[PDB]
Amino acid sequence: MKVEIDSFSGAKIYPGRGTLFVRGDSKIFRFQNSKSASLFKQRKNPRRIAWTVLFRKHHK
Amino acid sequence: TLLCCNCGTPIDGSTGLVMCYDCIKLTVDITQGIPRE
Amino acid sequence: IIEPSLKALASKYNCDKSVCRKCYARLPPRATNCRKRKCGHTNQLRPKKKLK
Amino acid sequence: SGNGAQGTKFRISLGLPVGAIMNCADNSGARNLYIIAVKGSGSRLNRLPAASLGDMVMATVKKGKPELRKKVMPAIVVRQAKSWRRRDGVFLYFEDNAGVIANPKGEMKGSAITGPVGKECADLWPRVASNSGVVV
Amino acid sequence: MATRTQFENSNEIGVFSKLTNTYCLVAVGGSENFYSAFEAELGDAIPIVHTTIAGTRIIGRMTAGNRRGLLVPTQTTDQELQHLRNSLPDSVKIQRVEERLSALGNVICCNDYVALVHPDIDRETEELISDVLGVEVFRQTISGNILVGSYCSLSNQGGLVHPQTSVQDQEELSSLLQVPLVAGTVNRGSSVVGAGMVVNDYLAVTGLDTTAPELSVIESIFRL
RNA sequence: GCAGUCAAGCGUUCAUAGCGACAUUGCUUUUUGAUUCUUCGAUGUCGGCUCUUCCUAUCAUACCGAAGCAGAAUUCGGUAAGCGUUGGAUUGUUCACCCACUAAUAGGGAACGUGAGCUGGGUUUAGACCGUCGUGAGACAGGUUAGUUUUACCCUACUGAU
Ligand SMILES: [Zn+2]
Ligand SMILES: [Zn+2]
């Protein structure tokens, strides 16, 4: 049993939960929930979304 | 530079082709399913 | 191995039979009528074809 | 299912029914595929049949190489956008419904497949797996 | 020599097997007939491993290996890695690559010395190929078909390509790989030779429809 | 439309493995014809959507029998109606034809099931156009186009509730 990480939020994803997405260039995206899933489809950048790990790590 | 892969001896072209012309003429048929009278 | 005696023994049960013309019921070779009600106990029988 | 299919596939959410137009992913010169019917389909009143990943369908070509089109041919899907579920619980979905031309025995027509391909089709049709570079 | 078999009812052996000069791989799908066709002409110096990487039976295309290394995709799990590591000699190093082209056996046509490879592979992946397998790489194509490990079967003794390969292409590739080639087919016209069969130094395995005209070429090109 | 008896004769020579004369008896109302018996101080008249049930003269499925039934594949036949019997192009269409899947894409009935259940494409009012007929008004079961589809709160039935 292995655990994954969301590509948008950097949340640990346990087995059973969330969708996955394979883009035309084959780069694969995992989404812990519809929130990150839809913020990805709206072309938002995680570095501007306050509650994400990328934001919090750039802001230190 | 291939072999006829049915009989073997006919070295044919790589324009994109299959077993020897005699082999497709005698063995293979694509007009079945019709009466000739 | 064939054992033609056992072949003739086998023929007693699967080949040495008659068949009714109407109901297609198998019957003994020494029959006089068919033994099934729905046909009519018909005296119109025929033998089974073994060869050909 | 055994129109040259190796094993038995688990069930996948029926994404693309008849009337659907899915891209083509091979180098056969076809640029789309209009599904008309499905193999292994079930018959229920007013239920139009449907095709899932890995399934084999009957298709028509609507764009490309006019020696191909105006005739029916078998096709095999390799991507769908409807989110299905693998038995490890995860859901997944591509961004485009896409298929491939083939013969009724499972052999492909082209020589390579652009884009990714589903595990659930590659395990089932080996010739597809041979002509594929990316499997998920 | 060349045996003939079927995995379940398929005449495509390179899809479900991966044969090297020191180990072999098979898919767990029954058919003791299919397993005996490997166990028969082999010694216990070549260990066979029944595995299914990424929950798949398509191992020969999803892997590419040599006699000193094995490359596997990022989709196979630690359980499978460990069943491989506990069952394969320690003379090889296994590495779970982390790149896009998951079908390694279609994009790599490798042997002990040389490796044809797909063009668009990462430069940090080709260097890992050289590192692990201990091989020099070449990245062009077969004859326009960029799936080298599927449209070209290859050994150190011999090599085989598909029947669209120009003679200039054959001369060029035979010069680069330093092994003679020849452009035939297998399983009655199947251009996909890298998958329709599998070969070693002293062994080949094809499908039951691999006829004698094809077996003759297979036993002429690969024995030498 | 279906069945049974005579079956010339065709069916490698081998009257029923099978197909078919001459006829002959005779069935069903699921077909036309005929009657005018019921409705002319309202039985709402085509088809389709929906939904249920029944029949068997079985398309498939199950089990058997026979075949110029080696196997495979088919045909015929017996019980058998438990379960199922499609998606679509054109057409108002029933009917039909064609494409495709399918185990199969069998036939039929219930006031030619079913309009206070729907729809209203058609037929079947008045408007209007063409063609033919007619001196003319006007006719055509000929073609085309537009054209209001009502009520349940009662009794019973049914579904559920006291
Ligand atoms: Zn030939
Ligand atoms: Zn009888």
XYZ file of C-alpha atoms (C1' of nucleotides) and ligand atoms in Angstrom:
673
model
C 0.000 0.000 0.000
C 1.429 3.307 -1.200
C 0.185 6.872 -0.759
C 0.159 9.567 -3.440
C 0.387 13.357 -3.537
C -1.941 15.772 -5.283
C -0.332 17.713 -8.108
C -2.231 20.928 -7.306
C -2.380 21.115 -3.498
C 0.316 18.667 -2.413
C -2.104 16.789 -0.160
C -1.574 13.150 0.708
C -4.122 11.017 -1.132
C -5.111 7.801 0.557
C -6.489 4.854 -1.402
C -10.011 5.245 -2.702
C -10.367 9.012 -2.828
C -10.138 11.356 -5.765
C -10.050 11.345 -9.507
C -7.086 11.091 -11.835
C -6.424 12.794 -15.153
C -4.295 11.829 -18.133
C -3.549 14.763 -20.396
C -2.900 14.481 -24.124
C 0.821 14.760 -23.484
C 0.393 11.816 -21.058
C 1.388 13.841 -17.989
C -0.750 12.440 -15.195
C -2.586 14.483 -12.571
C -4.128 13.307 -9.308
C -6.818 15.267 -7.510
C -7.737 14.702 -3.880
C -11.109 16.352 -4.459
C -13.333 18.216 -6.895
C -11.977 21.498 -5.531
C -8.472 21.041 -6.873
C -9.869 19.156 -9.859
C -11.959 22.162 -10.921
C -9.406 24.803 -10.023
C -7.166 22.943 -12.448
C -9.777 23.119 -15.218
C -10.184 26.845 -14.553
C -6.445 27.222 -15.269
C -5.692 28.606 -11.814
C -2.100 28.638 -10.617
C -1.413 27.049 -7.203
C 1.254 29.649 -6.498
C -1.540 32.248 -6.223
C -3.959 30.079 -4.202
C -3.352 30.679 -0.534
C -4.264 27.279 0.896
C -1.841 25.192 -1.179
C 1.570 23.806 -0.356
C 3.248 25.498 -3.317
C 1.959 28.871 -2.152
C 2.919 28.278 1.463
C 6.391 27.056 0.502
C 7.103 29.989 -1.798
C 5.868 32.342 0.926
C 7.930 30.531 3.579
C 14.655 -7.913 -49.510
C 12.102 -10.232 -47.922
C 10.994 -13.832 -48.428
C 7.590 -15.016 -49.671
C 6.993 -16.525 -46.141
C 4.564 -19.071 -47.665
C 6.817 -20.922 -50.164
C 9.993 -18.962 -49.404
C 12.126 -18.746 -52.532
C 10.587 -15.093 -54.205
C 12.629 -12.144 -52.887
C 10.253 -9.233 -53.401
C 10.313 -5.486 -52.873
C 9.872 -3.317 -49.797
C 7.346 -1.009 -51.448
C 4.951 -2.742 -49.029
C 3.932 -6.211 -50.087
C 3.183 -9.755 -48.991
C 3.808 -13.387 -49.932
C 4.690 -14.217 -53.595
C 2.296 -13.372 -56.440
C 1.922 -17.052 -57.295
C 1.224 -17.812 -53.600
C -1.537 -15.176 -53.379
C -2.886 -16.229 -56.781
C -3.202 -19.927 -55.947
C -3.903 -20.006 -52.201
C -5.649 -16.721 -51.383
C -9.118 -15.928 -52.744
C -11.171 -12.745 -52.331
C -14.088 -13.509 -54.701
C -15.771 -16.187 -52.569
C -19.431 -15.921 -51.634
C -20.932 -15.801 -55.142
C -22.368 -18.344 -57.612
C -20.722 -18.137 -61.033
C -23.992 -19.157 -62.711
C -8.004 -52.342 -31.156
C -11.572 -52.829 -32.416
C -12.821 -56.178 -31.058
C -15.510 -56.792 -33.735
C -17.426 -59.073 -31.354
C -17.843 -56.104 -29.020
C -18.811 -54.031 -32.062
C -21.690 -56.420 -32.799
C -22.531 -56.363 -29.082
C -22.634 -52.556 -29.238
C -24.860 -52.665 -32.329
C -27.594 -54.379 -30.279
C -28.307 -51.132 -28.403
C -27.595 -48.222 -30.793
C -27.885 -49.719 -34.304
C -30.195 -52.776 -34.163
C -33.342 -50.729 -33.571
C -36.356 -49.589 -35.594
C -37.894 -46.099 -35.742
C -41.531 -45.053 -35.999
C -42.467 -43.070 -39.095
C -44.707 -40.533 -37.321
C -43.189 -39.890 -33.868
C -39.530 -40.771 -34.650
C -39.426 -42.972 -31.541
C -36.867 -45.761 -31.464
C -38.421 -49.204 -31.043
C -37.326 -52.861 -30.913
C -36.605 -54.630 -34.221
C -39.295 -57.255 -33.489
C -41.996 -54.610 -33.187
C -45.600 -54.740 -34.378
C -46.768 -51.259 -33.289
C -45.367 -48.145 -31.674
C -45.711 -48.114 -27.885
C -46.407 -44.364 -27.424
C -49.955 -43.046 -27.017
C -49.612 -39.671 -28.727
C -48.645 -41.160 -32.097
C -51.587 -43.586 -32.265
C -49.919 -46.981 -31.738
C -49.416 -46.839 -35.496
C -48.559 -49.988 -37.423
C -46.617 -47.745 -39.855
C -43.001 -48.283 -38.755
C -39.654 -48.223 -40.548
C -36.166 -49.620 -39.825
C -33.098 -47.618 -38.818
C -30.525 -46.879 -41.507
C -27.072 -48.208 -40.569
C -25.010 -48.034 -43.771
C -24.637 -44.807 -45.735
C -15.875 -9.916 -26.308
C -13.793 -12.687 -27.851
C -13.448 -11.215 -31.334
C -9.757 -11.867 -30.908
C -9.761 -10.484 -27.368
C -7.377 -12.326 -25.096
C -9.036 -12.282 -21.682
C -12.153 -11.102 -19.910
C -12.314 -7.426 -19.046
C -13.974 -6.007 -15.998
C -16.755 -3.527 -16.480
C -16.020 0.059 -17.417
C -18.427 2.973 -17.379
C -20.077 3.216 -20.773
C -18.860 6.530 -22.025
C -19.502 6.923 -25.705
C -22.667 5.594 -27.348
C -23.692 5.362 -30.983
C -23.709 8.597 -32.875
C -20.469 9.413 -31.116
C -17.495 10.751 -32.988
C -14.139 9.969 -31.449
C -10.734 10.928 -32.683
C -8.495 8.408 -34.359
C -5.083 7.822 -32.860
C -3.274 5.809 -35.546
C -1.406 6.717 -38.724
C -4.043 5.179 -40.958
C -4.984 8.561 -42.404
C -8.353 8.708 -40.683
C -8.992 11.726 -38.501
C -12.224 10.713 -36.777
C -14.512 7.735 -36.283
C -18.291 7.735 -36.096
C -19.494 4.806 -34.033
C -22.621 3.085 -35.281
C -22.789 -0.110 -33.246
C -21.011 -2.231 -30.700
C -19.974 -5.830 -30.254
C -21.136 -7.785 -27.259
C -23.922 -5.271 -26.788
C -27.103 -6.128 -24.961
C -30.601 -5.596 -26.258
C -33.114 -3.543 -24.311
C -35.930 -1.445 -25.673
C -34.942 2.153 -26.359
C -31.474 1.623 -24.898
C -29.037 2.580 -27.502
C -25.853 0.556 -27.099
C -22.608 1.922 -25.815
C -18.890 1.419 -25.932
C -16.351 1.544 -23.151
C -12.578 1.489 -23.122
C -11.152 -1.638 -24.676
C -14.364 -2.447 -26.490
C -14.626 -3.218 -30.178
C -17.122 -1.297 -32.274
C -18.262 -0.792 -35.824
C -17.281 2.567 -37.118
C -17.309 4.792 -40.126
C -14.780 7.399 -41.153
C -15.952 10.961 -41.635
C -12.661 12.721 -42.373
C -9.578 11.489 -44.178
C -8.140 9.590 -47.150
C -11.304 9.023 -49.218
C -10.314 5.440 -50.051
C -11.190 4.740 -46.393
C -14.579 6.294 -45.893
C -18.111 5.456 -46.985
C -17.565 1.984 -45.583
C -17.975 0.287 -42.239
C -14.989 -1.134 -40.425
C -14.091 -2.446 -36.982
C -12.477 -0.154 -34.486
C -11.138 -0.338 -30.963
C -11.294 2.425 -28.444
C -8.183 3.391 -26.511
C -9.237 6.515 -24.610
C -12.443 7.843 -23.154
C -13.327 10.904 -21.119
C -15.918 9.257 -18.908
C -14.414 8.581 -15.525
C -14.311 4.887 -14.771
C -12.964 3.026 -11.780
C -10.143 0.586 -11.448
C -10.516 -2.082 -8.810
C -7.853 -0.268 -6.793
C -10.570 2.320 -6.225
C -9.024 5.175 -8.162
C -11.074 6.956 -10.783
C -9.532 8.291 -13.958
C -10.484 9.952 -17.201
C -8.722 11.120 -20.314
C -9.553 14.377 -22.090
C -10.626 12.928 -25.435
C -12.470 9.919 -26.706
C -10.176 8.181 -29.134
C -9.943 4.948 -31.025
C -8.094 2.928 -33.607
C -8.980 1.073 -36.790
C -8.537 -2.683 -36.823
C -9.561 -5.893 -38.501
C -12.108 -8.248 -36.937
C -9.405 -10.487 -35.487
C -7.705 -7.751 -33.448
C -4.902 -6.776 -35.815
C -4.379 -3.082 -36.318
C -4.272 -1.288 -39.659
C -1.678 1.373 -38.917
C 1.781 1.145 -37.422
C 1.785 3.376 -34.344
C -0.509 5.126 -31.907
C -0.230 8.766 -30.966
C -1.111 9.592 -27.410
C -1.685 7.422 -24.379
C -3.522 4.135 -24.267
C -5.485 2.389 -21.585
C -4.080 -0.514 -19.641
C -7.527 -2.098 -19.941
C -7.149 -2.226 -23.739
C -3.462 -2.997 -23.972
C -3.764 -6.057 -21.746
C -6.681 -7.276 -23.842
C -5.382 -6.670 -27.366
C -1.645 -7.387 -27.712
C -1.251 -5.860 -31.168
C -2.461 -2.584 -29.703
C 0.160 -2.847 -26.994
C 2.809 -3.491 -29.616
C 1.997 -0.336 -31.578
C 1.735 1.827 -28.445
C 4.436 3.972 -26.907
C 2.570 5.289 -23.893
C 0.364 3.163 -21.681
C -1.203 5.592 -19.231
C 16.460 -23.659 -32.217
C 13.055 -22.032 -32.741
C 10.100 -23.358 -30.807
C 6.489 -22.489 -31.564
C 3.733 -21.950 -29.027
C 0.833 -19.809 -27.880
C 0.457 -17.999 -24.587
C -3.259 -18.674 -24.307
C -4.371 -18.640 -27.927
C -2.155 -15.774 -29.156
C 0.713 -16.174 -31.584
C 2.465 -13.121 -30.085
C 5.216 -14.158 -27.702
C 7.279 -10.980 -27.415
C 4.251 -9.379 -25.792
C 4.160 -11.770 -22.831
C 7.851 -12.706 -22.602
C 11.261 -11.050 -22.297
C 14.165 -13.354 -23.080
C 17.826 -12.558 -22.433
C 21.111 -14.443 -22.439
C 20.936 -14.940 -18.650
C 17.289 -14.680 -17.542
C 13.759 -14.820 -18.894
C 10.342 -13.481 -17.995
C 6.844 -14.830 -18.498
C 3.310 -13.879 -17.577
C 1.272 -15.908 -15.129
C -1.427 -17.230 -17.449
C -1.362 -20.999 -17.149
C -0.507 -22.996 -20.260
C 2.178 -25.325 -18.970
C 2.649 -26.016 -22.677
C 3.716 -22.385 -23.033
C 6.050 -22.644 -20.045
C 7.619 -25.936 -21.128
C 8.563 -24.391 -24.471
C 11.005 -22.292 -22.414
C 11.924 -24.755 -19.665
C 12.754 -27.444 -22.226
C 15.721 -26.020 -24.131
C 17.174 -24.220 -21.098
C 19.319 -24.847 -18.062
C 18.902 -23.764 -14.463
C 21.485 -21.030 -15.159
C 18.666 -19.091 -16.859
C 15.964 -18.525 -14.211
C 12.400 -18.014 -15.385
C 10.189 -15.627 -13.411
C 6.393 -15.571 -13.480
C 5.424 -11.929 -13.040
C 2.822 -9.357 -14.042
C 4.080 -5.801 -13.904
C 1.610 -2.972 -13.322
C -1.048 -5.637 -12.931
C -0.520 -6.384 -16.622
C 0.383 -9.456 -18.602
C 2.055 -7.306 -21.298
C 5.564 -7.530 -19.880
C 7.713 -7.855 -22.979
C 6.524 -4.494 -24.267
C 6.365 -2.705 -20.920
C 9.935 -3.794 -20.101
C 13.306 -3.774 -21.821
C 16.294 -5.647 -20.445
C 19.698 -7.056 -21.238
C 22.016 -9.609 -19.660
C 23.086 -7.143 -16.945
C 20.157 -4.774 -16.453
C 16.405 -4.456 -16.537
C 14.351 -1.313 -17.081
C 10.757 -1.156 -15.856
C 8.240 1.702 -15.796
C 7.043 3.857 -12.917
C 3.673 2.070 -12.841
C 4.934 -1.189 -11.332
C 4.797 -1.576 -7.585
C 7.272 -2.492 -4.870
C 5.627 -5.899 -4.470
C 6.439 -6.774 -8.075
C 9.899 -5.220 -7.835
C 10.590 -7.428 -4.841
C 9.272 -10.607 -6.417
C 11.631 -9.824 -9.279
C 14.592 -9.004 -7.057
C 14.168 -12.132 -4.938
C 13.942 -14.323 -8.063
C 16.472 -12.866 -10.527
C 20.282 -13.086 -10.190
C 22.153 -10.276 -8.502
C 24.294 -9.774 -11.613
C 21.600 -7.409 -12.935
C 20.391 -4.130 -11.487
C 16.705 -3.272 -11.783
C 15.639 0.360 -12.041
C 12.154 1.869 -11.972
C 12.392 4.540 -14.648
C 10.311 7.698 -14.282
C 9.565 8.871 -17.824
C 6.677 9.125 -20.258
C 6.997 6.251 -22.710
C 5.776 3.505 -20.417
C 6.031 0.870 -23.158
C 9.760 0.406 -22.831
C 9.861 -2.735 -24.961
C 8.388 -0.872 -27.918
C 10.729 2.109 -27.640
C 13.944 0.180 -26.905
C 15.508 -2.564 -29.034
C 18.447 -3.585 -26.885
C 21.094 -6.264 -26.677
C 24.384 -6.704 -24.827
C 26.293 -4.054 -26.822
C 23.929 -1.702 -28.674
C 20.476 -0.227 -28.199
C 18.180 1.230 -30.785
C 15.849 3.634 -29.037
C 12.932 5.941 -29.685
C 13.758 9.539 -30.701
C 11.795 11.518 -28.116
C 13.237 9.761 -25.066
C 14.655 12.031 -22.395
C 18.389 12.631 -22.384
C 18.364 11.757 -18.680
C 16.754 8.427 -19.577
C 19.101 7.425 -22.385
C 22.022 8.041 -20.039
C 20.389 5.722 -17.517
C 20.056 3.131 -20.266
C 23.780 3.366 -20.933
C 24.483 3.338 -17.183
C 22.441 0.266 -16.299
C 22.448 -1.927 -19.376
C 26.009 -0.904 -20.194
C 25.177 -0.063 -23.775
C 25.693 2.522 -26.484
C 22.509 4.058 -27.875
C 21.224 5.046 -31.301
C 18.001 7.039 -31.809
C 16.642 7.241 -35.358
C 13.811 4.786 -36.296
C 13.385 1.419 -38.176
C 11.935 2.592 -41.521
C 9.741 5.436 -40.339
C 8.201 3.209 -37.681
C 9.525 4.821 -34.508
C 8.587 1.736 -32.451
C 11.953 0.054 -32.652
C 11.539 -2.639 -30.005
C 8.312 -3.735 -31.676
C 9.204 -3.513 -35.382
C 12.744 -4.857 -34.918
C 13.796 -8.068 -33.207
C 17.461 -8.084 -32.299
C 20.252 -10.107 -30.747
C 24.030 -9.818 -30.599
C 24.304 -12.663 -33.106
C 21.606 -11.448 -35.488
C 18.806 -9.021 -36.107
C 15.484 -8.884 -37.907
C 13.328 -6.032 -39.183
C 9.989 -5.541 -40.847
C 9.322 -5.804 -44.590
C 9.109 -2.061 -45.268
C 12.770 -1.496 -44.444
C 14.727 -0.026 -47.337
C 18.033 -1.582 -48.301
C 19.854 1.654 -47.539
C 18.201 1.594 -44.122
C 19.272 -2.014 -43.639
C 22.875 -1.259 -44.610
C 22.995 1.780 -42.321
C 21.496 -0.056 -39.359
C 23.611 -3.164 -39.864
C 26.675 -0.928 -39.884
C 25.665 0.835 -36.675
C 24.674 -2.318 -34.825
C 27.548 -4.360 -36.287
C 25.354 -7.438 -36.750
C 23.827 -8.625 -40.054
C 20.114 -8.036 -40.552
C 17.420 -9.277 -42.897
C 13.884 -8.031 -43.470
C 11.244 -10.753 -43.295
C 8.138 -11.501 -41.253
C 6.605 -13.895 -38.765
C 3.257 -15.521 -37.998
C 2.084 -15.246 -41.604
C 2.825 -11.705 -42.665
C 2.833 -10.063 -39.247
C 5.075 -7.053 -39.717
C 5.287 -6.735 -35.919
C 8.267 -9.008 -35.470
C 9.654 -7.620 -32.217
C 6.428 -8.733 -30.554
C 5.358 -11.752 -32.594
C 8.491 -13.576 -31.457
C 11.397 -13.522 -29.019
C 14.976 -14.663 -29.317
C 18.204 -15.317 -27.442
C 21.671 -16.420 -28.472
C 20.709 -20.119 -28.645
C 16.908 -19.915 -28.658
C 13.895 -18.466 -30.419
C 10.171 -18.732 -29.736
C 7.418 -17.860 -32.204
C 3.791 -18.637 -32.884
C 2.276 -21.807 -34.220
C 1.490 -19.996 -37.484
C 5.162 -19.127 -37.858
C 5.720 -21.297 -40.913
C 8.918 -22.972 -42.079
C 9.854 -20.300 -44.641
C 9.936 -17.894 -41.694
C 11.632 -20.309 -39.314
C 14.398 -20.851 -41.858
C 15.280 -17.158 -41.878
C 14.980 -17.094 -38.100
C 17.416 -20.001 -37.776
C 19.771 -18.547 -40.408
C 20.074 -14.996 -39.088
C 20.247 -15.709 -35.350
C 22.443 -18.800 -35.052
C 25.220 -16.635 -36.529
C -53.121 -18.628 -43.297
C -52.254 -23.624 -41.040
C -52.747 -28.897 -40.481
C -53.755 -34.516 -41.824
C -54.479 -38.961 -45.815
C -53.731 -40.626 -50.788
C -47.594 -39.048 -53.237
C -47.198 -39.159 -60.293
C -42.658 -38.385 -59.746
C -37.518 -35.215 -58.260
C -34.119 -36.470 -54.491
C -25.694 -40.350 -57.356
C -29.482 -47.060 -59.124
C -31.561 -46.483 -53.462
C -41.745 -43.840 -53.652
C -41.162 -39.478 -47.656
C -33.002 -38.680 -45.097
C -35.700 -34.270 -47.721
C -38.917 -31.273 -51.601
C -43.143 -31.809 -54.356
C -48.511 -33.807 -58.198
C -53.758 -34.852 -58.691
C -56.860 -34.260 -55.409
C -59.506 -35.361 -50.705
C -61.287 -34.391 -45.353
C -60.882 -30.217 -42.256
C -59.187 -26.210 -38.513
C -58.600 -20.904 -36.339
C -61.161 -15.517 -36.380
C -55.295 -13.523 -35.705
C -57.450 -12.052 -43.505
C -60.922 -10.284 -47.608
C -65.933 -11.246 -49.306
C -71.500 -11.489 -47.277
C -75.116 -10.540 -44.361
C -77.542 -5.946 -42.047
C -78.717 -8.827 -36.401
C -76.888 -4.576 -32.016
C -75.293 1.577 -31.755
C -78.404 7.101 -36.098
C -81.742 12.145 -28.920
C -72.456 10.948 -28.416
C -69.646 3.222 -27.913
C -64.799 9.618 -29.892
C -62.594 6.807 -35.928
C -55.343 5.385 -38.462
C -50.603 4.819 -36.586
C -46.983 5.561 -32.966
C -45.267 6.360 -27.326
C -46.341 3.788 -22.641
C -47.780 -0.537 -19.765
C -49.599 -5.321 -18.263
C -51.217 -10.114 -19.147
C -52.486 -14.420 -22.027
C -52.129 -18.119 -26.310
C -48.495 -21.660 -29.199
C -48.914 -22.787 -34.587
C -41.045 -22.452 -30.787
C -36.687 -17.529 -33.402
C -33.155 -18.387 -29.561
C -32.163 -20.944 -24.795
C -32.606 -26.335 -21.895
C -33.270 -31.891 -22.581
C -34.093 -35.838 -26.268
C -34.665 -38.688 -31.368
C -33.572 -39.276 -36.725
C -30.629 -37.934 -40.710
C -26.146 -38.809 -48.326
C -25.354 -36.895 -38.662
C -16.546 -39.028 -39.164
C -15.515 -34.410 -36.593
C -17.195 -29.509 -37.257
C -21.566 -27.360 -39.295
C -26.559 -27.879 -40.596
C -31.652 -29.893 -41.590
C -35.939 -32.384 -39.902
C -38.491 -33.971 -35.640
C -40.726 -34.561 -29.969
C -42.076 -32.587 -25.171
C -41.538 -27.638 -23.790
C -44.287 -20.912 -23.848
C -40.120 -20.962 -17.684
C -36.899 -16.365 -19.620
C -35.960 -13.296 -23.608
C -36.978 -11.590 -28.638
C -33.235 -5.159 -30.206
C -30.605 -0.086 -31.911
C -31.282 2.738 -36.509
C -31.887 5.324 -42.109
C -36.488 6.522 -45.654
C -41.875 6.597 -44.954
C -47.766 9.605 -41.398
C -47.776 4.923 -42.139
C -49.840 -0.696 -40.297
C -47.051 -3.528 -44.227
C -42.311 -3.173 -46.593
C -37.020 -2.558 -47.694
C -32.014 -1.699 -46.062
C -27.623 -1.064 -42.275
C -25.593 -3.049 -37.682
C -25.147 -5.640 -33.397
C -27.151 -10.118 -31.273
C -28.087 -16.328 -28.310
C -32.414 -14.593 -31.161
C -33.603 -10.466 -33.659
C -40.829 -16.031 -33.960
C -46.093 -15.344 -34.895
C -50.524 -13.605 -32.638
C -54.801 -11.861 -29.004
C -57.109 -8.792 -25.160
C -64.003 -4.039 -28.259
C -58.650 -5.247 -35.253
C -55.900 -3.893 -26.214
C -54.952 1.047 -24.909
C -57.257 9.513 -27.034
C -61.522 12.122 -18.955
C -53.538 7.913 -20.921
C -50.420 11.211 -24.528
C -49.485 12.862 -29.572
C -52.095 14.665 -33.940
C -47.901 13.133 -38.767
C -52.553 10.953 -41.688
C -57.707 10.611 -42.791
C -62.269 13.717 -42.284
C -65.339 20.411 -42.340
C -64.722 25.504 -43.636
C -59.349 28.949 -46.487
C -56.125 28.427 -50.792
C -52.896 26.216 -55.385
C -52.169 22.723 -59.711
C -53.911 18.788 -63.219
C -58.257 16.307 -65.481
C -63.855 16.646 -66.016
C -67.878 20.108 -66.566
C -70.971 25.720 -70.367
C -71.409 26.788 -65.098
C -72.129 26.384 -59.807
C -69.035 22.701 -58.605
C -66.667 17.009 -58.501
C -61.972 13.854 -57.982
C -61.844 8.059 -52.849
C -55.756 12.657 -57.255
C -51.258 15.625 -55.475
C -49.832 20.069 -51.794
C -50.086 23.456 -47.890
C -52.501 25.670 -43.062
C -55.999 24.009 -39.631
C -59.133 24.674 -31.025
C -58.272 17.201 -29.273
C -62.564 19.066 -23.423
C -64.373 16.995 -17.645
C -63.055 12.931 -12.877
C -64.151 15.863 -6.810
C -68.559 10.168 -7.912
C -69.220 4.103 -7.565
C -66.183 -0.042 -8.232
C -61.331 -1.945 -9.401
C -56.099 -1.110 -8.293
C -52.032 0.917 -5.421
C -50.626 2.339 -0.738
C -52.813 4.175 4.875
C -55.915 4.198 9.323
Zn 5.108 -17.563 -53.088
Zn -45.508 -43.272 -32.812
